[PDB]
Amino acid sequence: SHTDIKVPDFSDYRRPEVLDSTKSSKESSEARKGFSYLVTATTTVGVAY
Amino acid sequence: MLSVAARSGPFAPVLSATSRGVAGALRPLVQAAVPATSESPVLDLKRSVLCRESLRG
Amino acid sequence: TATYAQALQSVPETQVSQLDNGLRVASEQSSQPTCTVGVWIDAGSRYESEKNNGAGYFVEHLAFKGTKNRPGNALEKEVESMGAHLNAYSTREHTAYYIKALSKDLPKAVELLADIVQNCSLEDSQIEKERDVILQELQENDTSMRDVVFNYLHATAFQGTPLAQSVEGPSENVRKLSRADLTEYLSRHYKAPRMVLAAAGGLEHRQLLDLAQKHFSGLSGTYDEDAVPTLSPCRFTGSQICHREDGLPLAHVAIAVEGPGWAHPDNVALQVANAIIGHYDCTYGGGAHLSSPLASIAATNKLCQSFQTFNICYADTGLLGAHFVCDHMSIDDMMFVLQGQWMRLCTSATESEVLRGKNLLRNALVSHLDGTTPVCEDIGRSLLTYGRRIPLAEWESRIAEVDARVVREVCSKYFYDQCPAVAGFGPIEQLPDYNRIRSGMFWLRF
Amino acid sequence: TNIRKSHPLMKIVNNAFIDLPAPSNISSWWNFGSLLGICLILQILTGLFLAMHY
Amino acid sequence: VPPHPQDLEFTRLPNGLVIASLENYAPASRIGLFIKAGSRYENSNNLGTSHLLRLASSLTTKGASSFKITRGIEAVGGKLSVTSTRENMAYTVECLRDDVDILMEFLLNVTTAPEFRRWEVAALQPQLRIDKAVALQNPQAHVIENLHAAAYRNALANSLYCPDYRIGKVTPVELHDYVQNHFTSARMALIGLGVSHPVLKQVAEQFLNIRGGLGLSGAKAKYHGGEIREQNGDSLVHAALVAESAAIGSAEANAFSVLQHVLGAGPHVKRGSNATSSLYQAVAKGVHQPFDVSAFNASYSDSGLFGFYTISQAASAGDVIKAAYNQVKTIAQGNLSNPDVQAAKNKLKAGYLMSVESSEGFLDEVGSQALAAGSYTPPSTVLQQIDAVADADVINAAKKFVSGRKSMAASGNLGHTPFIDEL
Amino acid sequence: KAVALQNPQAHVIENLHAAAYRNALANSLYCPDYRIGKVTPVELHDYVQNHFTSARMALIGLGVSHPVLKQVAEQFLNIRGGLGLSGAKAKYHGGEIREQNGDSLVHAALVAESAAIGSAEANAFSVLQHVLGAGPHVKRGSNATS
Amino acid sequence: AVSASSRWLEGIRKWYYNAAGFNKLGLMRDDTIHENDDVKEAIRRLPENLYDDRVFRIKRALDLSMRQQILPKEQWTKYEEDKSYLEPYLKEVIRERKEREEWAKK
Amino acid sequence: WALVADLLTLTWIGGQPVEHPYITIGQLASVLYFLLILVLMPTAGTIENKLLKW
Amino acid sequence: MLTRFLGPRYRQLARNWVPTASLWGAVGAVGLVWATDWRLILDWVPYINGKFK
Ligand code: HEM
């Protein structure tokens, strides 16, 4: 009855690298953390200036 | 046909250094589950069930 | 008097044969008057679709309840009369059917296992009886907060994949699985290359092979045939499921990063690391004095009723982390200490503690493989996953290799700056926000 | 309940100056802390009134 | 080919200490010290002392600190455990082959040099409450504990778990007094697995030569009979009905053990109907609700308890007990086939041999044997002893149950649970 | 309960009745611990409806007139849809309950089935009580006639 | 054996004891010890009788210190009568810490 | 009290010209300030411990 | 009293944190050089020669 708890579809909100259910996410975690940390890096550079 | 508890019936308790406390006996509970709803206090104010230090490489 | 090293060499070789079938037949001979015999199948909920899900578990309920040669209770009557024990399990990847019997009863034990695995009746009246039995077991499983969080952990970590599914399946599937759904499962899955006949105890291999040729001949020996799937890889997702229930007296939390598969060599060093963090329970001797800093602080500060490390393995993926049970005001502290230990091991694992982790694994492995039953399970499962039995001396060589550098590299690969999967059930208001869990996966000082 | 004990502001005054458990036996030499505080407020008040004209 | 197995080696010392060892050339070793120090050796003035002792194994000793015991054992990946029955305490120690000496030293310090420091004793007292609460979350533990208190005047009447009134009240002197009285050479057995006999014999002569304790094996357990009834409302009624049977090691005990398997012990099949279980089938005839039944068999040094245990719905408790009691009555009246005894003998023989498969099960069996009998009996002579039970012995054992003064314990909603009287 | 059970006599007399009776007089005056928190509004409503009825009731007044009581009883105490009268019948059984305490003093009570109230036999029991000795008559006395 | 040198060594010890002056307040030596973690643990381990005696001695001394008074000379604690009641508790606490510290080295 | 009196001496030398007796005694008082704190007071505490058999 | 922190565990913990301590030293030095526009170092950085004459 707890077994009726499926997690709802997040395909609407997912990054394009992690839409494929048959693909490992490990293959794109470096690129995806890369992008978001580059944002914070670029910001800190700008704020330091 | 010795051992008091492994004649299967009377109660043994175990404490350990590294391993969880046990109580064991031949009272029944395996064929008690089989016709069903024993809605058991499993991880209420409690312990942990089945034997740890039990993993492969 | 013998060394530990000598003693590992003295453990006898697992003999393996293959039938023309494709059915692998494998044994470890010992002195024992008793044996365990069984069939290990590459079948479980990972092989099932949304419509199929729970079929293997349904088959488990029917497997012992009548065959074509022994109808109704007649199999039960034979097992009981010889003093034998008949058991089954279904995981996500593996199904097993096994007999504990006297060694002299190995011919009938193999005979019965063949009859179960090939010639199961699935009488329509029996399927209907089992429907109500499975539903009550679902109602039961619901009360087990441990079973619930682990189902939730799978359901969130593996999301859109067949590894998200429970073994037992949803209640609607239980009520609408027909005989034809089950027959199709058994036809597709219970094929000789995908199954292993395993034994441990007081038997010769030759005798096991002869019985395999007697009773398992003509599963696949003209057939095998078109449409198989291999297993598609299962996407892991960094995610959180939070079943808030304040009526429940203690919180259950399970947290895991993506493990590698069964196959992967760095499972060994991950297990060394997991042994260092260890397990705890409120009934352990040693509060303050326990070696594990998580165990020591959890005992001293009353953070905990229990915790456990785990490394659950599937083909090409896993769940690596930790489960704990605690009071509503203790979740935040438990997480902080848990994550700090992962971060400590990633960055700054020292040598003495790695040796302790190594020794704990050596003791765990030898303690586990003690009895006909755990050794038989190890034969059956290993041949499915690895293809060989990996001998105790090999595991030793793999454990010995692990030092502090190996712990810190291998931990960094899986733990460091990685998205965990989180499952929470119970009084979970003080369960840290996911962003704040995520932030615990790296250290700013490093 | 008292007002003094649980009012969020009066709480702080209570725990610092009223209900604060103090050693029975502290001498003359323990007077200098309050006296330093007095000295600070004295320097503040006179100083402001000097800053009004300086 | 494995190695052809070594035989067990066995030695009684003049002081009465038994030493038993096997060299199975195994990567891990197991050492047990088995002591005639279980809860039966408590009196009215010191109840729960052996509980607190069972919980005190990693406390400071003369040769190793609390900290050293915990860290030194954990460093080599070892275990230290204490298993108690009503008769025995069993101090077990597991490690790899190379580490036996450190684990031996720790084992010897726990059992022969404990300090029971007042502050370490005090800090431990709340562990009694936790350990009891965990154990008593199985309804079976409260039932079997009440069952013995109902059965016995005396000694086997004692709980394995400390009485609540005693939590916080068990003293350092009582723990010291319990060890001095009971952890002596004549009351002790040193059992080793994957150690040499000379190394054990050397340990026993050097470190286990103690006597100023007590003369042996009881106050004598006075069977009494009676009932304890615990209202619970607990969804399911747990009930146990028993009579005085046979002391362990008597031929009569073997008749009781076979009777147990006629009537039905545990299940053999995952989710099975228990077709060859006499009690199960007799209850199942007239009871259509969820239930369980088992034959109960507890044998001791100087007494035994035999009968049955029932889990049922509150309203069905009476029906289930009476159906089960009548099925034993059918066997007492002589309605027992030779195939039934032969099946039951097969279940016993297989069950025992499986019970001694692991190191854990073998060591407990060898330890208990050494305490109860003063000997080791190989599996083939246990099996010979089982075989010698005639059908008439099984009938007679069932007859002793039916005519014997009864003991009963029940927990649940008891509005439909009968009163010995009413059976 | 905790206040009442600080007299050892209350636990003894409560155990004494549970030992004595199968049934009904076996019930404790005080709620069983497992039941604390579990007694429902419906059970209280059910208890009043079943038991607080005209046939099971007596209105007693001291320093009020009989007409004022009679008026109260006819106007406000005309209830019946309850139970038929005065028991399930109390089945005497016998037996023992034993509570280890270590309590410095042993409190013990030993009893047999005697006589129902209002029988002439009950009066014999009441006299027997005073032969044997009930409470003390003298402050600090040796109880000479007990 | 040792006679003349020992009494002089004891003499300087006894002289300093009197000049220290905690005995004028009825304090024992062990009452005056700075409460670090080792010391707080030693207090905790004290038996009932010694714990309570310790508190009364502190209370009576703090009371005197408030009034800036001392005991009558009769009632001063004699150097010879000064019971080192904490020392064996404290020594054991130190020994326990040092073992933990050695284990933490390896 | 030797420190306090050293500080009194240093306050005296502070208020006087950089000339004959005042230079060398100012140097000696400066040495003694750092000698009392860094060396002499921590040696006294150790001696006092040894004296009390502590 | 600081004999406490001498032993093989503490040497290994020193070895583990040393690339990090030196990389933080690198952050601090380049940070101080940048924030003060420091002359001696920044004349020698082959782009960022925006003084010239
Ligand atoms: C924020 C509060 C303060 C204000 C607004 C303030 C303002 C003043 C002003 C306007 C003067 C110049 C007038 C004069 O020399 O008489 C002065 C001088 C002085 N201030 Fe303050 N003051 C403050 C607190 C302080 C404190 C805390 C001290 C340190 C104890 C201090 C030490 C003095 C001294 C020594 C002088 C020189 C007095 C003299 O000899 O004429 N003042 N301050």
Does D31 contact ligand 1 (Cβ within 6 A)?
Answer: no
Compute the nearest-CA separation of D16 from chain G (Å). 22
Range of the domain at B49: 1-57
Residue ID of nearest Cα to ligand 1 atom 10: D51
Interface of G to E at Cβ within 8 Å reads 44-45, 47, 96, 99-100, 103
| Mutation to test the G interface, candidates H47, H48, H53, most G Cβ within 10 Å | H53
Do E240 and E277 lie in one domain? The reply is: yes
Is E423 an 8 Å CB contact of chain C? no
| Cβ–Cβ contact E266 with C under 8 A | no
> Is residue E85 domain-resident?
yes
| Nearest-angstrom CA–CA distance, C146 and C141 | 9
Final residue before a domain boundary, out of E159, E185, E211: E211
Token digits for C330?
């203790």
* Whether residue E240 is found in the same domain as residue E159: no
* C58 close to C175: Cβ distance less than 8 angstroms: no
What are the structure tokens assigned to C297, written together? Answer: 């602080």
Between the alpha carbon of residue C425 and those of residues B42, C157, C252, E134, the distances in Å are 14, 15, 5, 21
Q: What angle do CA E183, E188, E194 make, to 5 degrees?
A: 120
Indicate if E228 and E318 belong to the same structural domain.
Answer: yes
Tokens 């604390």: give the residue.
F36
Q: How far does the centroid of ligand 1 lie from the alpha carbon of residue H4, in Å? A: 28
CB B8 within 8 A of CB B26: yes
Q: What single DSSP character describes residue F84?
A: -
Strand partners, C244: C426
Q: Whose CA is nearest to atom 41 of ligand 1?
A: D50
The domain G1-106: what is its CATH number?
1.10.1090.10
Kindly report the CATH number assigned to the domain that includes residue B6. 2.10.210.10
**End of a domain among E179, E211, E243?**
E211
The 10 Å CB-count burial string (b at 16+, else e) for E343-361 is bbbbbbbbbbbbbbbbbbb
Q: Are E188 and E33 in contact (CB under 8 A)?
A: yes
Q: How many residues does chain B have?
A: 57
The DSSP element (H or E) to which H48 belongs, if any, is helix H41-51
Cβ of D36 closer than 6 Å to ligand 1, yes or no, is no
Q: Which residues of C touch E98 (CB under 8 A)?
A: 3-4
Distance CA E72, CA B13 (A): 25
Closest to C192 in 3D by CA, of C57, C89, C42: C42
Instruction: In chain I, count H helices and then E strands.
Output: 2, 0
Chains with at least 3 CB pairs less than 8 angstroms from chain H? G
The two beta strands, C195-201 and C251-259, are: unpaired
The answer to whether C252 touches C323, Cβ cutoff 8 Å, is yes
Handedness of CA F113, F118, F119, F123 (dihedral sign): positive
Q: Which of E270, E278, E280, E386 to mutate to test the interface with C (most CBs of C within 10 A)?
A: E270
Residue nearest ligand 1's atom 2 by CA: D44
Cβ pair C60, C2 in contact under 8 A: no
Q: What are phi and psi of C226, to 5 degrees?
A: -70, 165
Sign of the four-CA dihedral C313, C314, C317, C321: negative
- Binary contact (B28, E54; C-beta < 8 A): no
Closest approach atom of ligand 1 to CA D53: 10
Domain ranges of chain C: 14-227, 239-442
> At C120, which amino acid appears?
C
Ligand 1 centroid – CA D46 distance (Å): 8
Ligand 1 atom closest to Cα of residue D39: 30
Q: Is residue B18 within 8 Å of residue C332, measured between CB atoms?
A: no
Pick the atom of ligand 1 nearest to D51's CA.
10
d(CA E113, CA G102): 24
d(CA E295, CA E308): 4
Burial pattern F23-51, b for ≥16 Cβ within 10 A else e, equals: eeebebeeeeeeeeeeeeeeeeeeeeeee
Quick check: H48 contacting G, CB < 8 Å?
yes
**What's the rounded Cα separation, in Å, for the pair E247 and E268?**
27
Which residues of C are less than 8 Å from B56 in CB distance? 365, 368, 378
| DSSP secondary structure of C121-184 | ---HHHHHHHHHHHHHHHHHHTT-HHHHHHHHHHHHHSTTSGGGS-SS--HHHHHH--HHHHHH
Buried b (16+ CB within 10 A) or exposed e, E284-315: beebeebbbbbbbbbbbbbbbbbbbbbbbbbe
Residue with tokens 């008057």: C33
Contacts of E387 in chain C (CB under 8 A): none
Q: Which residues pair with C199 in a beta bridge?
A: C27, C37
Which residue among B16, B25, B44 sits closest to E140, beta carbon to beta carbon? B25
Strand pairing partners for E312? E237, E291
Single out the residue of B30, C131, B38, C129 nearest to residue E290, CA to CA: B38
Q: Could you tell me the domains of chain A? A: 1-49 (1.20.5.270)
Q: Which chain I residues are Cβ-neighbours of G106 within 8 angstroms?
A: 7-9
The answer for C 239-268 residues in CB contact with B (under 8 A) is 249-250, 252, 267-268
The answer on E157 and E26 residing in a single domain is yes
Q: At I41, which CATH number?
A: 1.20.5.220
Contact state of B1 with E364 under an 8 Å Cβ cutoff:
no
- The residue of chain B nearest to residue C392, with distances taken between CA atoms, is B57
Residue nearest to atom 27 of ligand 1 (CA): D43
- Burial group, residue C266, by CB count within 10 angstroms (0-12, 13-18, 19+): middle
CA distance G95 to C94: 54
Structure tokens at E278: 């006499």
Experimental method: X-ray
Which of F35, F96, F100 is the closest to E163 by Cβ?
A: F100
Q: Report CA dihedral (C360, C366, C372, C376) to the nearest 10 degrees.
A: 80
Strand order in the sheet with E304-313: E226-231, E406-412, E236-244, E304-313, E291-299
H or E stretch covering C96: strand C95-102
- Cα H5 to ligand 1 centroid, rounded to whole Å: 30
- Is the Cα dihedral C41, C42, C45, C49 positive or negative? negative
| Domain housing I14 | 1-53
Query: In angstroms, rounded to a whole number, what is the distance separating the alpha carbons of residues E206 and E209?
Result: 7
- The minimal CB distance from F32 to the residues E165, E231, E421 is found for E231
Q: How many residues does chain H have?
A: 54
Buried b / exposed e along F118-146 (16+ C-beta atoms within 10 A): eeeeeeeeeeeeeeeeeeeeeeeeeeeee
DSSP H39: I
User: Which atom of ligand 1 sits closest to the CA of residue D54?
Assistant: 10
Spatial separation of the C-alpha atoms in residues I18 and F137, rounded to whole Å: 91
Chain A adjacent subunits, 3+ CB pairs under 8 A: C
Q: Which spans in C216-266 are helix H?
A: none
Domains in chain E, number? 2
Q: Does any CB of chain E come closer than 8 Å to the CB of residue B55?
A: no
Task: Give chain I's domain count.
Answer: 1
What's the CA gap between E356 and E383, in Å, rounded? 13
What's the CA gap between E133 and B21, in Å, rounded? 11
Of C11, C77, C136, the residue nearest C396 (C-alpha) = C11
Q: Is G82 exposed, middle or buried (0-12, 13-18, 19+ CB in 10 A)?
A: middle
Tokens 């040729």, residue located:
C213
Cα dist from E391 to C56, C331, E278, E305, whole Å:
44, 61, 16, 20
The whole-angstrom separation of Cα C146 and Cα E170 is 36
Ligand 1 neighbour D51 (Cβ under 6 A): yes
Contacts of I6 in chain G (CB under 8 A): 105
- N- to C-terminal Cα distance for chain G? 44
Alpha carbon of E123 to those of C24, C385, H38: distances in Å? 57, 48, 44
Quickly tell me which residue has 């490690």 as its tokens. E95
Smallest CA–CA separation between G13 and chain H, in Å? 5
Q: What are phi and psi of C326, to 5 degrees?
A: -160, 160
Residues in chain A: 49
- Say whether E343 and C133 touch across the interface (CB within 8 A): no
Cα E80 to ligand 1 centroid, rounded to whole Å: 73
Residues of chain C with Cβ-Cβ distance to B16 below 8 Å are 284-285
- DSSP code of residue E223: B
Q: For the domain bounded by C14-227, which CATH number is listed?
A: 3.30.830.10
User: Which of B2, B28, B45 faces E266 most closely, judged by CB atoms?
Assistant: B28
- Quick check: do C14-227 and C239-442 share a fold? yes
Q: List, by residue number, the catalytic residues of C.
A: 60
DSSP H or E segment with residue C8 = helix C4-9
Tell me: do E295 and E394 sit in the same domain: yes
To 5 degrees, how large is the angle CA C281–CA C282–CA C285? Answer: 90
Sheet strands (E) in E171-315: 188-193, 226-231, 236-244, 291-299, 304-313
Please report which helix (H) or strand (E) contains residue C35, including its range. strand C34-41
Closest CA relative to residue C289, chosen from E315, E21, E74? E74
The DSSP 8-state label assigned to residue E136 in this structure reads T
CA dist list (Å): G70 to C261, G23, G66, G81, H32: 79, 9, 10, 19, 35
Cross-sheet strand order for the sheet of C195-201: C15-18, C24-29, C195-201, C34-41, C95-102, C85-90
- Give every CB contact of residue D18 below 8 A, 6+ residues apart in sequence: D4
Count Cβ atoms below 10 Å from residue I7 Cβ, excluding itself: 16
| C55 in Cβ contact with C63 (< 8 Å) | no
The token duo for E101 is 């000496």
Residue appearing with tokens 């398992």: C216
Ligand 1 near D16 CB (within 6 A): no
Which residue is listed with tokens 């199985």? E138
Provide the domain limits for residue E180. Answer: 1-211
Residue G36 burial by Cβ neighbours in a 10 Å radius (0-12, 13-18, 19+): exposed
CA torsion through residues G6, G9, G15, G20, sign = negative
Q: For the beta carbon of residue C412, count every other beta carbon within 10 angstroms.
A: 16
User: Closest chain C residue to B53 measured between Cα atoms?
Assistant: C364
H52 class by beta-carbon count within 10 Å (0-12 exposed, 13-18 middle, 19+ buried): middle
Q: Helix, strand, or coil here: G16?
A: helix
CATH of the domain at E68: 3.30.830.10
Atom of ligand 1 nearest to the CA of D40: 27
What is the secondary structure of E153-174 as a DSSP string? SSSTTS-SS--GGGTTT--HHH
Q: Give the whole-angstrom CA distance, residue C362 versus residue C395.
A: 8
Q: Which residue has the CA at smallest separation from atom 42 of ligand 1?
A: D43
Q: Which residues of E213-244 are buried (b: 16+ CB within 10 A; e: fewer)?
A: bbeebbeebebebbbbbbbbeeebbbbbbbbb
**From atom 6 of ligand 1, which residue's Cα is the shortest distance away?**
D47
Distance (Å, whole) CA G54 – CA G76: 15
* C235/C242 Cα distance (integer angstroms): 21
Tell me how crowded residue C391 is: count the other CB atoms within 10 A of its CB. Answer: 15
- CA angle, corner C136, sides to C43 and C75, nearest 5? 55
Q: Which of E180, E211, E242 is the last residue of a domain?
A: E211
Helix (H/G/I), strand (E/B), else coil: F122: helix
Residue E332 vs residues E6, E223, E395: alpha-carbon distances, Å? 44, 22, 5
Question: Strand B22-24 relative to strand C34-41: parallel, antiparallel, unpaired?
Answer: unpaired
The answer to whether residues H28 and H6 touch, using CB atoms and an 8 Å cutoff, is no
Residue among E301, E57, E49, E300 nearest E181 (CA)? E49
Going from the Cα of D42 to the center of ligand 1, the distance in angstroms, rounded, reads 10
**Nearest CA among C347, C335, C336, C331 for reference residue C417:** C347
Nearest to C42 by CA among C184, C246, C263, C193: C193
Q: End-to-end distance of chain I based on CA atoms, in angstroms? A: 58
Chains with at least 3 CB pairs less than 8 angstroms from chain E: B, C, F, G
Helix-helix angle E338-355:E251-263, to 10 degrees: 100
G41 is written with which tokens? 């643990």
What residues in B contact E271, CB-CB < 8 Å? 34
Q: CA nearest E346: which of C331, C101, C208, C211?
A: C101
Sequence-separated contacts (24+) of A5-10 with Cβ below 8 Å = A5/C151, A5/C152, A5/C155, A5/C241, A5/C243, A6/C155, A6/C164, A6/C170, A7/C155, A7/C156, A7/C159, A7/C164, A7/C239, A7/C241, A9/C160, A10/C159, A10/C237
- Please tell us whether the domain made up of C239-442 is placed in CATH 3.40.50.300: no
What count of other Cβ atoms lies within 10 Å of the Cβ of residue B10?
Answer: 27
Q: Chain I: nearest CA to C348, how far in angstroms?
A: 6
Pairing of strands C24-29, C195-201: parallel
E332 and E282 in one domain?
A: yes
- Interface touch E346/C81, C-beta < 8 Å: yes
Whole-number Å distance, alpha carbon H11 to ligand 1 midpoint, is: 23
Residues E271 and E184 in one domain: no
Residue nearest to atom 14 of ligand 1 (CA): D50
Query: Encoding tokens for residue C188?
Result: 């597709």
E236–chain C Cβ distance below 8 A for any pair: no
